[PDB]
Structure formats: C-alpha cells, structure tokens
C-alpha cells in the first residue's frame, strides 16, 4: 500500500529490494552494509537512507543498546532532509523518529519532530493527536489542551482526542466537565482509548461528584486488565506481589524499622514540631488535587530514594536514624515525610501510583477524636508512638474533624517480596 519509492528509486528497486530482503531475513549486519553501500552510491535516495535507518533500528533492538538507536534517530532525520521524498515515506520516517525519541525519553526532541509532522501534514488528525501526547509528556497541559480542542472541532467524534481532553480537564479539576469526554472516548473503542489512565480518572471523577456508576468503570477496567482489582487501582506495578490493604509489622518483615520508629517516636515528633514552629515553609501544601476541603501539608525528607539535604537540616536526628534502613531510604517509589492535617479536612478517596511500596504511618500528634483513615474496607485510627502499615495502591480516604492539628510520619518501604535486582532497576516514581 504505502508508496515509498520516488522516481529515481524505482530505477534502483532491484538493489533496494535485495538490501531490504537481507534486513527482513534478520541478516542485520549484511543489510546495514548493503544499505550503506546504496547510500554512498545513491546519496540522494530516500529509500536507501530509510533502509539504513531501519537497519540501525533493528540493530539497537537486537543489541538492546540505546547508542545504536540514537544513530538510527539521526538517520530517520536524514531521510526527511533528502529531496523528492514521497509523502508516505516522509511520514513513516519522522513518526518512527518521534516514537524512538520517546522510547529513549527524549521528550523535547520528540515534541519537535511532532510539530514538524503536523506542519508537513496539516490534515492528518492522528498526527495532531500524537502532537498532543508530545505536549503531555513534557508537562505542557495548556498546549495539549489546545491541540485536542482543534482535533475535536474538526473531528468531534475522535475518541482518542476525547479521552485525552477529558484527562486534561480532570487534571484541571474540571471534574463534571471531564466525565462525558472520558466516558464517550472509552466507549468509542478507538485505538488508544483502552487505557488504564482513563478508567482510573473517569471512576475517580464519578466518585467525586457522587455518581454511583464509578465502580462499574472500575470493574470494567479490572475486566480489561488495567487494575489488579476493583479496589487496588495502581498503574505502575509488578504483578504477583501480595496484595492486601493492611499489613502487620511481621507481615512486612521490616520489624527493626518499626521498632526504631516506635521506640524513638518522641524525637521524630519533636523535630517535626520544631520545623512547624521555626521553619514552617518547609511544609508544602499537598498539590495533587486530593482534597475535597481543608489544610494538608507535608515536609519531605526523602523522595525517589534521594535525601533532601536541606530538609534534613531541620530533622537531623530523624534523618540519621533513618539512614540505617535502606528499605525506606532507597525506596525509589516512595517517600519519607512528615504530614500535618488540620480540622475540616477530607481527603478524596484515591489510590497511589504503584503496588511496589507499602506505607508506614507513625503517630506523632494525634487528637483524641476526629481523625481516621479508611483503606479499602477497613477504617483505623492513629496512636501516638505507634505504626500503622497499609498498601496505598488500594483506595484510601482520610478525615480530620478534630479541634487541633494531626501530625504523622510517613515512611514508605519497598514491597517486601521485591527482589534486590527489582529494587535496583524499577524506574523511580
């Protein structure tokens, strides 16, 4: 179907086909050398250049080397720099360039390739959708929104644009408005719409507006493999890890960590209280749209397995104490942080992002009544000097209706069944 040969390339199709045959037989090295010969003999040939690139791409795949794939990315660009490139080949080449840039994590350069693609092919709606994703991946939600509004104005029924518009709206706290877009885009069945993110956020928005249908979408997402279960809706996970909402110290195997937190709880408290009194700006408001109302702030000592040195100046003995426990200080998918919540606070039901951590809560200042945390189908209360442990990849909710502040200490650990090599390689969250 695709027309990849311009006028001159049709006159050397025999050579081009011979080289491509080598590539599709898996004789990568031979194909590479054959296409390099064709590029030196026919330096303006788009199809020869594309063969060189595709061969480098296959080579990176076989060698699992990013270095080789960067070479291929430049060759994909070279293709588009030649004269008289057929439109189908131009698009294939720059699309694969963008996709491999994203694979490597080069989101800014992928964005650039996508802007070029949309300029070259102004009527291809799918390229505009891909450009929207490019904007999302660098955190530019404002431009992603404009892109999908353009798509929807020319193609109102595009399901991919619908779910992504809905996702942007919901992240902007436009909850009610987001629901029809997320729902209709998932129901569209269009490619790219069967995505856990959209089931997760459609169900959440429904829950927040009181729509009792949210768990139908949770059950559909579970049926389609995005969620380990209805209640545990994390999206970055290692399948097979024991899944339960509440853990005992012994169940975790981190008994020394728990003992250390409990036996020393007063110094942990007192350093947190000194930061409250004399360095309150180290506590930062929760910024993930998880509150229905109230005041909630966190003072973070570790995130993604990286110690915040400035932060630890304010809790130096606590940081020194925790250094002895790599199971938390090296948990690249958790945090260590103080958490203060004030009266009148309701945290929306929500899920954390990964089933790869468990979450310890050490009580520090706990009002006698008004404070409680539900996880899945179990509600519990804190106690000063005592650790609770739950899997925050399960849906959980918190209320603060006391008459004064509630201070806890949050220590995330690696899920205990994760192997050493898993703990070392899983990308940080």
């Amino acid at each position: 179907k695709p027309k990849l040969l311009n006028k001159f390339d049709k006159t050397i199709k025999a050579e081009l086909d011979a080289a491509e045959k080598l590539r599709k037989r898996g004789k990568i090295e031979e194909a590479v050398n054959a296409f390099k010969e064709l590029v030196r003999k026919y330096p303006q040939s788009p199809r020869a250049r594309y063969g060189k690139a595709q061969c480098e791409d296959d080579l990176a795949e076989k060698r699992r080397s990013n270095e080789v794939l960067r070479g291929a990315i430049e060759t994909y660009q070279e293709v588009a720099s030649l004269p008289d490139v057929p439109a189908d080949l131009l698009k294939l080449s720059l699309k694969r360039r963008s996709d491999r840039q994203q694979f490597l994590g080069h989101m800014r350069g992928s964005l650039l390739t996508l802007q070029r693609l949309v300029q070259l092919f102004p009527n291809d709606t799918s390229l505009k959708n891909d450009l929207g994703v490019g904007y999302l991946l660098i955190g530019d939600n404002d431009n992603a929104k404009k892109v999908y509004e353009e798509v929807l104005s020319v193609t109102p029924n595009d399901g991919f644009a619908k779910v992504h518009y809905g996702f942007i709206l919901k992240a902007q706290n436009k909850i009610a408005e987001s629901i029809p877009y997320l729902k209709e885009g998932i129901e569209s069945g269009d490619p790219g719409t069967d995505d856990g993110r959209f089931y997760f956020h459609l169900g959440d928005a429904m829950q927040r507006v009181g729509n009792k249908e949210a768990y139908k979408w949770y059950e559909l997402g579970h049926k389609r493999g995005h969620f380990a279960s209805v209640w545990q809706r994390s999206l970055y996970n290692v399948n097979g890890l024991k899944a339960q909402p509440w853990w005992t110290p012994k169940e975790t195997g981190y008994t020394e960590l728990v003992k250390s937190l409990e036996r020393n709880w007063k110094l942990i408290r007192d350093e947190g209280l000194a930061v409250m009194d004399k360095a309150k700006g180290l506590f930062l408001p929760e910024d993930e749209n998880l509150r229905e109302k109230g005041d909630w702030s966190q003072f973070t000592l570790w995130q993604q397995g990286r110690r915040n040195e400035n932060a630890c100046k304010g809790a130096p003995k606590t940081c020194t104490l925790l250094e002895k426990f790599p199971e938390t200080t090296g948990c690249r998918r958790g945090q260590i942080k103080y958490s203060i919540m004030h009266p009148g606070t309701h945290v929306w039901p929500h899920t954390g992002p990964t089933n790869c951590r468990l979450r310890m809560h050490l009580g520090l200042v706990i009002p006698k009544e008004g404070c409680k945390i539900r996880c899945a189908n179990e509600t519990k209360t804190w106690e000063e000097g005592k650790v609770l442990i739950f899997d925050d990849s399960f849906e959980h909710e918190v209320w603060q209706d006391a008459s004064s502040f509630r201070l806890i200490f949050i220590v995330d650990v690696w899920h205990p069944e994760l192997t050493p090599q898993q703990r070392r390689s899983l990308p940080a969250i």
Partner: peptide, 18 residues
C-alpha cells in the same frame, strides 16, 4: 510534576530506553 500520593500526571516515570 511527580506522582507522589496519586496518579494525576499523564505519566509517572521518566523512561530511558532499554
């Protein structure tokens, strides 16, 4: 933006190839 307590970002990891 990072995914700390929730799943609000379009992606929560920053991948780096193979």
């Amino acid at each position: 933006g990072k995914c700390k307590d929730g799943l609000g970002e379009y992606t929560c990891t920053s991948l780096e190839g193979f």
